[PDB]
Design an enzyme around this catalytic site. Structure first.
Site, short mmCIF file in Angstrom:
data_model
loop_
_atom_site.label_atom_id
_atom_site.label_comp_id
_atom_site.label_asym_id
_atom_site.label_seq_id
_atom_site.Cartn_x
_atom_site.Cartn_y
_atom_site.Cartn_z
N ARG A 44 0.82 -1.19 0.00
CA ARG A 44 0.00 0.00 0.00
C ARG A 44 0.84 1.22 0.00
NH1 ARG A 44 2.00 1.80 5.60
NH2 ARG A 44 3.46 2.35 3.98
N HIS A 51 1.45 8.86 10.47
CA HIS A 51 1.62 8.81 11.92
C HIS A 51 0.48 9.40 12.74
CE1 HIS A 51 5.80 7.16 12.05
NE2 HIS A 51 6.08 7.94 11.01
N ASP A 53 -2.67 7.41 12.56
CA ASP A 53 -3.49 6.23 12.68
C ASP A 53 -3.59 5.79 14.12
OD1 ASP A 53 -0.86 4.67 12.47
OD2 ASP A 53 -1.92 3.14 11.22
N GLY A 156 11.06 -3.44 3.80
CA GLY A 156 11.62 -2.30 4.48
C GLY A 156 11.57 -1.08 3.58
N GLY A 158 8.74 0.51 3.40
CA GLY A 158 7.70 1.39 3.89
C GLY A 158 6.42 1.23 3.05
N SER A 160 4.76 -1.56 3.30
CA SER A 160 4.09 -2.53 4.06
C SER A 160 4.01 -3.93 3.50
CB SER A 160 2.73 -2.00 4.44
OG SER A 160 2.04 -3.04 5.09
N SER A 161 5.18 -4.50 3.23
CA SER A 161 5.24 -5.88 2.81
C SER A 161 4.77 -6.68 4.05
CB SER A 161 6.66 -6.19 2.35
OG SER A 161 6.90 -7.58 2.32
N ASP A 208 -2.23 -0.02 7.53
CA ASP A 208 -1.66 -1.00 6.60
C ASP A 208 -2.62 -2.09 6.25
OD1 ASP A 208 0.49 0.60 7.17
OD2 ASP A 208 1.82 -1.07 7.81
N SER A 255 14.27 0.48 5.73
CA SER A 255 13.66 0.92 6.97
C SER A 255 12.69 -0.15 7.50
CB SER A 255 13.09 2.33 6.79
OG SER A 255 12.66 2.94 8.01
N1 LIG Z 1 8.25 -11.38 1.39
C1 LIG Z 1 8.29 -11.69 2.59
N2 LIG Z 1 8.48 -12.98 2.96
C2 LIG Z 1 8.59 -13.42 4.26
N3 LIG Z 1 8.51 -12.63 5.30
C3 LIG Z 1 8.30 -11.34 4.96
C4 LIG Z 1 8.18 -10.82 3.69
N4 LIG Z 1 7.96 -9.45 3.74
C5 LIG Z 1 7.95 -9.17 5.04
N5 LIG Z 1 8.18 -10.27 5.82
C6 LIG Z 1 8.36 -10.31 7.25
O1 LIG Z 1 7.77 -9.13 7.72
C7 LIG Z 1 8.79 -8.25 8.31
C8 LIG Z 1 8.41 -6.78 8.18
O2 LIG Z 1 8.38 -6.37 6.82
P1 LIG Z 1 9.48 -5.28 6.39
O3 LIG Z 1 9.14 -4.75 5.00
O4 LIG Z 1 10.84 -5.89 6.36
O5 LIG Z 1 9.53 -4.13 7.50
P2 LIG Z 1 8.43 -3.10 8.01
O6 LIG Z 1 9.13 -1.80 8.34
O7 LIG Z 1 7.81 -3.71 9.24
N6 LIG Z 1 7.34 -2.76 6.86
P3 LIG Z 1 7.49 -1.92 5.48
O8 LIG Z 1 8.77 -1.11 5.46
O9 LIG Z 1 6.32 -0.98 5.39
O10 LIG Z 1 7.53 -3.00 4.32
C9 LIG Z 1 10.10 -8.69 7.67
O11 LIG Z 1 11.24 -8.28 8.45
C10 LIG Z 1 9.86 -10.21 7.57
O12 LIG Z 1 10.20 -10.89 8.80
O1 LIG Z 2 1.87 6.38 9.14
C1 LIG Z 2 3.00 5.64 9.56
C2 LIG Z 2 2.66 4.17 9.40
O2 LIG Z 2 3.84 3.49 9.80
C3 LIG Z 2 3.77 2.09 9.55
O3 LIG Z 2 3.59 1.95 8.14
C4 LIG Z 2 2.61 1.50 10.40
O4 LIG Z 2 2.42 0.08 10.19
C5 LIG Z 2 1.30 2.23 10.14
O5 LIG Z 2 0.25 1.74 10.99
C6 LIG Z 2 1.45 3.75 10.23
O6 LIG Z 2 1.47 4.35 11.54
MG LIG Z 3 9.00 0.96 7.48
#
Ligand SMILES: Nc1ncnc2c1ncn2[C@@H]1O[C@H](COP(=O)(O)OP(=O)(O)NP(=O)(O)O)[C@@H](O)[C@H]1O
Ligand SMILES: OC[C@H]1O[C@H](O)[C@H](O)[C@@H](O)[C@H]1O
Ligand SMILES: [Mg+2]
Ligand SMILES: [Cl-]
Length: 509
Positions: A44, A51, A53, A156, A158, A160-161, A208, A255
């Site tokens: 998404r 920040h 939510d 990482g 941001g 939201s994987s 997310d 991140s």
């Molecule tokens: N493709 C994937 N396969 C398996 N585990 C995953 C995968 N994507 C995410 N995860 C798990 O979810 C955690 C958080 O997703 P990640 O993207 O690394 O960080 P985040 O800051 O929490 N989110 P964001 O930066 O918004 O994607 C990862 O550190 C993994 O442990």
């Molecule tokens: O807006 C910042 C954003 O940070 C991450 O993506 C969190 O998972 C969300 O819930 C939100 O607070």
């Molecule tokens: Mg992040």
């Protein structure tokens, strides 16, 4: 509405049409059998409303063409377990047994492991299942499973994987246990997944999850958390000569919210909560688990304006109250622009350092010297306000440029706030924004938590548009400079033009 189930017979959503087949093969290769179904949940983008939510303020997200796919096979085992396989070498194979008594699997944040995130979705799905078919799930285990996971959401980033993963899992898990004749409601999905991450120690809002679940192709969403959790899709306005386009540009600065939670993510959650409580005290009110900034808004009004009924989201009234709130912040927090010490706070709340501490600093460990209550609240209120306005725009323009500018401005204001008040920006983001603005962008800002990750840009699309212009400049002025070894391929993958995607869904096999 329910979560959409698709079959072979079913035109199929691009993404399914495009990815299943392959994942399907991978599953066979992995497990020597065909999966039963495939669950998907996208990534998404948050247009604006960062920040807030976690304070119950409404946001403006969008689901994207990046997702998580879960190929699943349901088993009949004496002693049920779960086997996890990932398309990514980075993610090693995991395998665990499900408690026979119907108890939950232990989640240990002490470790940073991908299975944890799986367990997170499992848990919420589980809890839900118990309520639904207590008979079946009360003191008995869930079905064992064979899972194959392949995600294309850059981690990482941001984007939201994390949530794409959790949501796909929760979905898959419910389906596996309820069976084929069972149909999930988007609402339940959402509602149960919105807190899943708390299990892993991250105190976020459900933005997310709400987006991953409620996305609709070609639609943006207006997500609300109170008085009721709700997502409302809408289409952008129709311009005459242009296309409203949103471009994402990854900074390529990894991140991960969990890793820096104590000084970053989770520290913010604390400052805002703290602030909410200081204001209360400063205004002689009782907030209520502590209350939030939205809580203070209602209470104040209730106590001093005689408004019995809590804020409903009405836009116009909201603008009014927030503005007011901004005034109070200025009036009572601004004397400590430098930060509040634990001493300043405890005194502010009629506390002992120990009280402040038990009550505030222990549910989740945070690290700091001072708490920036002024700036954090200031951001929250103002960012919330910005959303209300954006919604008005997206909903209610002579010249196309009238929209570009107006909306762009809001974006720019949001970035500034994030950077200057919330301090979650970064040089790379900063640099991307500058280049974009000078080269075609109307509004540029980070998206997601910040501290790296991606950026969003409002750029005029289509034929009469400037997408290529921006893209090019970014390539030349940022990437090629900061990442000389970068390949056209990587580059291509760093800059995306986004289109609203469909949220969670199912493919049956
Ligand atoms: N493709 C994937 N396969 C398996 N585990 C995953 C995968 N994507 C995410 N995860 C798990 O979810 C955690 C958080 O997703 P990640 O993207 O690394 O960080 P985040 O800051 O929490 N989110 P964001 O930066 O918004 O994607 C990862 O550190 C993994 O442990
Ligand atoms: O807006 C910042 C954003 O940070 C991450 O993506 C969190 O998972 C969300 O819930 C939100 O607070
Ligand atoms: Mg992040
Ligand atoms: Cl569980």
């Amino acid at each position: 509405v329910i979560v959409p189930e698709f079959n072979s017979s079913a035109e199929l959503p691009r993404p399914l049409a495009e990815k299943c087949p392959s994942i399907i093969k991978k599953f066979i290769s992995a497990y020597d059998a065909k999966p039963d179904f495939v669950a998907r949940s996208p990534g998404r983008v948050n247009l604006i409303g960062e920040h807030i939510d976690y304070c119950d303020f409404s946001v403006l997200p969008l689901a994207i063409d990046f997702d998580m796919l879960c190929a699943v096979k349901v088993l009949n085992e004496k002693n049920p377990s779960i086997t996890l396989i990932n398309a990514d070498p980075k993610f090693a194979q995991r395998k665990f047994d499900l408690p026979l008594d119907g108890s939950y699997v232990t989640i240990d944040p002490s470790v940073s492991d991908w299975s944890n995130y799986f367990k997170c979705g499992l848990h919420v799905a589980h809890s839900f299942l118990k309520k639904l078919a207590p008979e079946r799930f009360a003191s008995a285990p869930l079905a064992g499973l064979q899972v194959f996971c392949e995600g294309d959401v850059p981690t990482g980033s941001g984007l939201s994987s994390s949530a794409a993963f959790i949501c796909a899992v929760a979905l898959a898990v419910v389906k596996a246990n309820m069976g084929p004749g069972y149909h999930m409601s988007k609402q339940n999905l959402m509602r149960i997944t919105v807190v899943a991450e708390h299990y892993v120690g991250v105190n976020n809002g459900g933005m997310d999850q709400a987006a991953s679940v409620c996305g609709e192709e070609d639609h943006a969403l207006y997500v609300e958390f109170k008085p009721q959790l709700k997502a409302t899709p809408f289409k952008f306005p129709q311009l005459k000569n242009h296309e409203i386009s949103f471009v994402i540009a990854n900074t390529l600065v990894v991140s991960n919210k969990f890793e820096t939670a104590p000084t970053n993510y989770n520290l913010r959650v604390v400052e805002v909560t703290t602030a909410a409580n200081v204001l209360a005290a400063t205004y002689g009110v009782v907030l209520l688990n502590k209350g939030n900034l939205r809580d203070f808004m209602n209470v104040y009004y209730a106590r001093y304006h005689n408004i019995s009924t809590p804020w409903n989201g009405d836009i116009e009234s909201g603008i009014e109250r927030l503005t007011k709130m901004l005034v109070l912040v200025e009036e009572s927090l601004a004397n400590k622009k430098q930060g509040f010490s634990v001493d300043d706070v405890a005194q502010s709340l009629n506390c002992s350092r120990e009280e402040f501490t038990r009550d505030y600093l222990t549910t989740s460990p945070v690290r700091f010297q001072v708490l920036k209550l002024y700036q954090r609240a200031k951001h929250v209120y103002s960012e919330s306000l910005r959303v209300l306005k954006a919604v008005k725009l997206m909903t209610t323009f002579t010249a196309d440029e009238d929209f570009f500018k107006q909306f762009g401005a809001l974006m720019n204001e949001s970035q500034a706030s994030c950077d200057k008040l919330y301090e979650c920006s970064c040089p790379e983001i900063d640099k991307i924004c500058s280049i974009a603005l000078s080269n075609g962008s109307y509004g540029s800002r980070l998206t997601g938590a910040g501290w790296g990750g991606c950026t969003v840009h409002l750029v005029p699309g289509g034929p009469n548009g400037n997408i290529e212009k921006v893209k090019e400049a970014l390539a030349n002025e940022f990437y090629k400079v900061k990442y000389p070894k970068i390949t056209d391929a990587e580059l291509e993958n760093a800059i995306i033009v986004s289109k609203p995607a469909l949220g969670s869904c199912l493919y049956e096999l």
